[PDB]
A paper describes a structure:
Like all known class II chaperones SycD exhibits an all α-helical structure. Six helices (H1A, H1B, H2A, H2B, H3A, H3B) fold into three tetratricopeptide repeats (TPRs), tandemly arranged motifs of some 34 amino acids length.
In order to verify that YopD binds to SycD via the proposed sequence motif 58PELIKP63 we co-crystallized N- and C-terminally truncated SycD21-163 with a synthetic peptide corresponding to YopD56-65 (56QVPELIKPSQ65). The chaperone peptide complex crystallized in the trigonal space group P3121 with one monomer per asymmetric unit. Direct hydrogen bonds are formed between the hydroxyls of SycD Tyr40 and Tyr47 and the carbonyl oxygen of the peptide residues Ile61’ and Pro58’, respectively, and between the guanidino group of Arg146 (H8) and the side chain of Gln56’.
Author numbering:
A (entry chain A): 29 to 159
B (entry chain B): 56 to 64
Write the structure that this text describes.
Amino acid sequence: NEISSDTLEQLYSLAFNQYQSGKYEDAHKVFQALCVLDHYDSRFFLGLGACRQAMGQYDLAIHSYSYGAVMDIKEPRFPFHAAECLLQKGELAEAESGLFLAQELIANKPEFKELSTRVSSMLEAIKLKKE
Amino acid sequence: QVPELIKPS
């Protein structure tokens, strides 16, 4: 029945607002349904994964980020947030690839300035462990 | 510090 409008934007705004109020459980329910309505929009998977990350659900988060990565191969926020989750699980080699990928996708784009510094900080911590 | 989402509309 996807002759559904851009009431999709109304739903995204609501889920976005719930997330900023720390209502992660409610936000995740909306984001989940949005992923059902339009499985090609990457904001919905970033949102869904973010809620799972916020609630400590690392494997579920990585799963949503993986999907987002498939539909938006240029978006560095997916491997970067997955790398965070993989770090929390103590999976350092996998986290490293995540960070290196993010770094490739960010390149020297000005909008990801602070995000670059976090990436480098994490790569430096994993690097020293292998000594 | 939770992940930062894309802004709406």
